[PDB]
């Protein structure tokens, strides 16, 4: 009544509103996903974390305050921004901005999981994931923004959202954790984004990399990236719930193994060579061989704890695994050939392996010295680092019959005459267009689904054009308008200019003209 009431102090915990979320949906005929999917089984699942909006915000904001305290206050007062080894500070231009687009695409894929979820609790989870993926886009951007302010080379930290478009390594990044998520079956994102992408590849990509950063003097990236991954544990919990629903109903389970192998191959095709190259060639101090990192995170832990355990329930070890293990051992060395050979098209300054590096490469990958090692040492002899040399190794590859091809499906470069990783060139003509495919898994994808895979490659866009003109047109220059962002060494002197590139007379060919 007007006088008597319980005056005990009470609030309402997030758990207490959360148990009512399932009742927030209501039935009407049009209440179903807008996106095409193969998966129509029952998916009325409970989310494993009792997150509501206010608590979502409290949780994430508490993370940010600590992170930005460490960046803007502590590490700035220590001058840590310039305590990074140049190889690694250059590597974070690529890793943070490339990951940034993976995060940005993950917002869109998580919105597809939100849209295709049928249970209100799973819509709740995917909303938080969508927000997290926005958080991670701004975190990756903050890393380069911070480096832009405090690191000795802001060029390329400070404009990658336009300068990435110059080079060929960025094409395949728009697939690996990007188009490959959002351009396809929406509930299949529980498999490609989550069960493969988040459960498998974020761990080396986002966590393991912080040990390499630290080894090389970067305490910025551990501060941000580790925080990023704290959100990932909620993400995969969402996806697992759906994977269970798929596994349990026989009509959906008959798609899961093919979607899993396709997603595994699609992500590892780019991730394996590119991240291994950035780790091992974009560092001075190495933590461990890339192939062991891959063995530990990808093959043994993700492979056994997720896939092998799901084997009890009909999920198969990816048929492409054997081809992938060959990639883990050699493909990043293959890619280094292309990366160093085509250095003017990037936005980072590279460093040929020094004598210490080369011994490490040969100790850990015997045969490196007699193959990759001798090539890099000849390039150095020819003036690879010297802007007056007139030497760019891409022209040298062609003059020795080492053509570079772009995979029509994955966009990953391939040098068949020098590769030790998985691959063989297939060149098909279809309706007057020539196409180069590079492995059994992607070739099947293109043969079955040609209208999904019409990505123009750098040779088709740049055909007949001289290198310095492509670079200038794409704004691949420092603020003086002439000195390249990209460099074949990491020293402060003898930086290459557009005129230095021009003297080499490199003009883009049609690699399939010979077929």
């Amino acid at each position: 009544d007007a006088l008597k009431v319980n005056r005990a102090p009470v609030g309402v915990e997030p758990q207490e509103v959360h148990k009512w979320l399932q009742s927030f949906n209501w039935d009407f005929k049009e209440n179903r996903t807008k996106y095409p999917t193969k998966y129509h089984m029952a998916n009325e699942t409970k989310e494993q974390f009792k997150v509501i909006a206010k608590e979502y915000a409290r949780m994430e904001a508490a993370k940010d305050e600590r992170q930005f305290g460490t960046l803007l206050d502590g590490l700035t007062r220590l001058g840590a921004g310039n305590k990074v080894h140049p190889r690694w500070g250059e590597t974070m231009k690529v890793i943070s901005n490339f990951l940034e687009v993976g995060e940005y695409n993950a917002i869109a894929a998580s919105a597809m999981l939100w849209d295709s979820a049928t249970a209100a609790e799973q819509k709740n989870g995917y909303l938080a994931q969508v927000l997290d993926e926005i958080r991670h886009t701004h975190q990756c951007a903050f890393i380069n923004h911070y480096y832009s302010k405090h690191y000795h080379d802001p060029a390329g930290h400070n404009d990658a959202r336009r300068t990435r478009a110059i080079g060929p390594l960025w094409k395949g990044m728009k697939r690996v954790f990007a188009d490959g998520f959002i351009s396809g079956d929406a509930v299949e994102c529980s498999v490609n984004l989550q069960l493969v992408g988040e459960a498998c590849f974020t761990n080396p990509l986002i966590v393991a990399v912080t040990e390499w950063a630290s080894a090389n003097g970067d305490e910025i990236t551990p501060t941000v990236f580790l925080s990023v991954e704290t959100d990932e544990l909620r993400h995969m919990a969402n996806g697992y719930q759906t994977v269970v629903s798929i596994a349990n109903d026989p009509a959906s389970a008959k798609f899961l193994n093919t979607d899993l192998n396709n997603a595994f191959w699609t992500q590892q095709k780019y991730f394996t060579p590119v991240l291994g190259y950035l780790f091992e060639y974009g560092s001075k101090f190495k933590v461990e061989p890339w192939v062991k990192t891959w063995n530990r995170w990808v093959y043994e832990d993700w492979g056994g704890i997720w896939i092998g355990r799901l084997g009890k329930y009909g999920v198969e070890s990816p048929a492409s695994l054997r081809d992938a293990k060959r990639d883990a051992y050699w493909a990043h060395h293959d890619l280094a050939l292309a990366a160093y050979a085509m250095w003017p098209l990037g936005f980072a300054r590279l460093a040929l392996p020094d004598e210490e590096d080369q011994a490490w490469f040969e100790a850990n990958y015997p045969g490196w010295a007699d193959h990759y090692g001798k090539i890099f040492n000849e390039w150095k002899k020819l003036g690879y680092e010297d802007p007056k040399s007139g030497f760019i190794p891409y022209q040298w590859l062609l003059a020795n019959g080492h053509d570079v091809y772009i995979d029509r499906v994955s966009q990953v470069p391939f040098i068949p005459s020098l590769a030790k990783g998985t691959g063989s060139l297939r060149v098909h003509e279809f309706n007057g267009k020539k196409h180069s495919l590079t492995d059994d898994w992607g070739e099947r994808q293109w043969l079955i689904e040609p209208e999904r895979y019409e990505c123009h490659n750098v040779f088709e866009q740049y055909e007949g054009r001289e290198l310095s003109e492509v670079i200038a047109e794409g704004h691949g220059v420092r603020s003086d308008g002439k000195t390249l962002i990209a460099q074949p060494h990491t020293r402060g002197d003898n930086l290459w200019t557009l005129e230095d590139i021009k003297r080499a007379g490199c003009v883009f060919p049609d690699p399939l003209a010979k077929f």
Binding site: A108, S148, Q461
Partner: protein, 392 residues
């Protein structure tokens, strides 16, 4: 000990720090330290909001404003692009132009909402200790607030889910952020209404915070019939993501939503002695104005006045407004039937009171949205059309 190497930190280990210092040049290699310096600033100086958000979306030159080139690497079966112009009827010279006037990237967004989250719980712990619920009109509390405010959570929840395809489909970074923050704010509204109900249940024996009655009212009570039909259409009947955002926030929620939240539940709380509900509506109405600021920029500043497609966009926005304003007028006509259930308060619940509340909502909307896209509207005609649903 441990199996793996204890990696030495380059920042602090003497040998690695000395090696690093010898490798780092004594001079900067460029002077341009402004992250993405080439962004065209909306305001007098480039903001951190813009630096962190603008051009994260990797659009090619064939989606207006894109700096990239070439086709996507992988498309849908059939050929649907990862993002494409087919996603909406509206056109522009640059999909990146949009700027939230609150300049919310993720961090300021959760920072502000964290404040509300923690302070809400401190207020509830003290409100329960205060015993201030003792003076609330019990009929309002039990028959109107619990039942019909509870039912309103489903309108907020539907508008929240309307954003799922917008978050996938929309064509730039700042738009995607504006959309998703709006969606969280909508589902927050729904969770906050349910929080208030759960909170009252702890103070009032016999008060049932279950959503069974609110859900029955949302799904079958004629008072919400028009509102639910409109929300279902905006959420699940369309996929043009601009139409969803415009119909959702700029027509339906700015007319029906503002009437229900502000003219009915918030306003009438302060004539029925409800010292609790104003604390919750303060949040939903703050979120409404923050969302309105960003929705207004996208459709008024950017699309309705785009130098090449402004009039073209106003043609569509005029057509959507015509359709969804009719829908919202129908939702309000149904909704004012609720006044036949409330205790009469002169100037609030009689015909003059409801007439003035509809004049504020429709008058405000004419100023805030209709006048800015060239949509003509007779305010009195719309007020009178709703008052036909009012039982004297």
């Amino acid at each position: 000990p441990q199996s793996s190497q204890v990696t030495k930190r380059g920042l602090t280990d003497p040998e690695r720090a000395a090696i690093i210092a010898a490798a780092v040049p004594d001079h900067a290699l460029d002077t341009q330290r402004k992250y993405h310096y080439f962004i065209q600033p909306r305001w007098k100086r480039l903001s951190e909001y813009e630096q962190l958000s603008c051009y994260a979306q990797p659009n090619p030159d064939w989606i207006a404003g894109g700096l990239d080139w070439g086709d996507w690497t992988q498309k849908f079966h059939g050929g649907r692009p990862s993002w494409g112009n087919e996603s909406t009827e509206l056109r522009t010279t640059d999909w990146y132009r949009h700027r939230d006037p609150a300049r919310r990237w993720h961090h300021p967004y959760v920072k502000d909402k964290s404040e509300e989250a923690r302070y809400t719980q401190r207020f509830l712990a003290a409100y329960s200790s205060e015993g201030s619920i003792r003076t609330i009109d019990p009929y309002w509390r039990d028959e109107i607030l619990n039942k019909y405010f509870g039912a309103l959570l489903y309108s907020e929840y539907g508008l929240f889910n309307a954003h799922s395809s917008v978050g996938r489909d929309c064509l730039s970074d700042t738009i995607r952020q504006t959309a998703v923050f709006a969606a969280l704010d909508k589902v927050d509204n729904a969770q906050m209404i349910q929080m208030e109900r759960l909170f009252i249940a702890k103070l009032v024996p016999g008060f049932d915070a279950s959503t069974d009655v609110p859900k029955k009212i949302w799904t079958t009570d004629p008072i919400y019939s028009g509102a639910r039909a409109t929300v279902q259409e905006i959420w699940q009947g369309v996929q043009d993501w601009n139409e969803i955002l415009w119909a959702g926030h700029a027509v339906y929620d700015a007319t029906f939503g503002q009437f229900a939240r502000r003219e009915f539940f918030q306003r009438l709380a302060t004539v029925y002695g409800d010292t609790l509900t104003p604390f919750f509506t303060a949040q939903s109405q703050t979120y409404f104005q923050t969302t309105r600021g960003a929705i207004d920029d996208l459709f008024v500043y950017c699309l309705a006045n785009d130098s090449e497609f402004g009039a073209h966009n106003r043609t569509f926005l005029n057509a959507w407004t015509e359709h969804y304003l009719a829908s919202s007028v129908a939702a309000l006509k149904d909704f004012v039937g609720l006044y036949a259930k409330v205790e009469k308060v002169a100037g609030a619940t009689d015909r003059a009171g409801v007439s003035e509340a509809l004049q504020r909502v429709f008058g405000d909307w004419k100023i805030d949205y209709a006048d800015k896209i060239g949509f003509r509207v007779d305010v009195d005609q719309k007020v009178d059309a709703v008052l036909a649903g009012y039982k004297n």
